[PDB]
Design a binder for this molecule. Sequence first.
Ligand SMILES: *[C@@H]1O[C@H](CO)[C@@H](O[C@@H]2O[C@H](CO)[C@@H](O[C@@H]3O[C@H](CO)[C@@H](O)[C@H](O)[C@@H]3O)[C@H](O)[C@H]2NC(C)=O)[C@H](O)[C@H]1NC(C)=O
Ligand SMILES: *[C@@H]1O[C@H](CO)[C@@H](O[C@@H]2O[C@H](CO)[C@@H](O[C@@H]3O[C@H](CO)[C@@H](O)[C@H](O)[C@@H]3O)[C@H](O)[C@H]2NC(C)=O)[C@H](O)[C@H]1NC(C)=O
Ligand code: NAG
Ligand code: NAG
Length: 324
Amino acid sequence: DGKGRTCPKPDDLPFSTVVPLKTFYEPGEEITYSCKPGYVSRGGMRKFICPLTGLWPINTLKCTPRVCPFAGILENGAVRYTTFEYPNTISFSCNTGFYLNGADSAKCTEEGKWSPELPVCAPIICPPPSIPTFATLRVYKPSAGNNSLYRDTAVFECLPQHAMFGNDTITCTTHGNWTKLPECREVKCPFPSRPDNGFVNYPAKPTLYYKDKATFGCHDGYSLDGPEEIECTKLGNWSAMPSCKASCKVPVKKATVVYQGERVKIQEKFKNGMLHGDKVSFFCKNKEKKCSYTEDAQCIDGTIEVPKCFKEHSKTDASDVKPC
Ligand SMILES: *[C@@H]1O[C@H](CO)[C@@H](O[C@@H]2O[C@H](CO)[C@@H](O[C@@H]3O[C@H](CO)[C@@H](O)[C@H](O)[C@@H]3O)[C@H](O)[C@H]2NC(C)=O)[C@H](O)[C@H]1NC(C)=O
Ligand SMILES: *[C@@H]1O[C@H](CO)[C@@H](O[C@@H]2O[C@H](CO)[C@@H](O[C@@H]3O[C@H](CO)[C@@H](O)[C@H](O)[C@@H]3O)[C@H](O)[C@H]2NC(C)=O)[C@H](O)[C@H]1NC(C)=O
Ligand SMILES: *[C@@H]1O[C@H](CO)[C@@H](O)[C@H](O)[C@H]1NC(C)=O
Ligand SMILES: *[C@@H]1O[C@H](CO)[C@@H](O)[C@H](O)[C@H]1NC(C)=O
């Protein structure tokens, strides 16, 4: 006692480590502060001898994280980060059009450097595309040397007499390959039958291929129940096969009717008969409630059923009676 003093357990400083660590020390004993790995201090390792007073000195040591080289700028991309100090991770991604050449993330090591090495963004690019069999291509600019860049496109057309299957355009994708490629096959259609009461035309040659046109027509009594022009489709048949159907003679001498939602005189509107499929609504009275309604009738291959309740006058035309 008096001379028999000791030093206490040393203070535990931020991110430090002390050796030898004991609960008390005789005077003359030595301790050694050192920053934890990943950290560093103004001056570094402090060393103290327990003095006779039993009081450890003042400790200048202040330990702070190492800082890895600045890494907040990724040419053509983006770095997510807190700080570039140990032991933080930082992650990377590229702007659109570019791919990441290197690791997606990196850690600041205790050694004070980035692991893995910081990546780089690079242009996504596709190689020259292959021409499918029986095709040419006539949309192709290589925008990157001989190679195409992301979202570039090429477009193929078949040969004459050949039918494409699949979209005609390919795009250079994110992964540096092109989108699904089309196929070009040869397609044949049979000869089209001439229709009863009409005619049909096509060019004078031994067999008929994809996108060949055939045009139809009817004799004066008749009209088509389909399109005037057809073509040879990809599946080896035609667009349609139209018939020549018979017109109807005006079913009555005089009457007002609805034709496509408008009142017309059937004698004026169909003076030269009704075409096949021409539909019309006739006016009939409801005898009981002294009002008027319509019922329909249609030309069907030279026949039109003038509805039962209609009556032809040389009281008034249901036309002129109020609606029900
Ligand atoms: C261009 O290259 C990419 C990348 O390799 C191709 O994408 C890959 O496509 C395959 C199939 O489309 C994916 O695999 C799987 O197929 C099975 C079928 O058994 C399916 O059940 C799974 O759900 C899955 O889709 C593969 O995951 C995918 N890879 C990537 C990274 O997306 C692509 O097909 C290529 N494009 C062309 C035109 O060849
Ligand atoms: C030209 O010829 C084709 C092929 O022979 C005709 O296609 C027929 O219709 C479809 C495909 O277009 C085939 O698939 C199935 O049809 C049913 C109809 O109920 C549909 O609901 C389903 O999705 C099913 O996949 C069908 O098998 C095929 N017919 C035959 C006999 O093979 C096409 O319609 C023709 N075009 C003209 C304008 O004549
Ligand atoms: C593509 O570029 C290479 C490298 O310069 C060159 O040798 C080659 O002739 C080019 N190909 C075409 C089709 O121009
Ligand atoms: C193929 O591509 C577009 C969209 O990618 C699609 O809407 C259409 O089926 C095709 N368009 C053209 C112009 O060929």
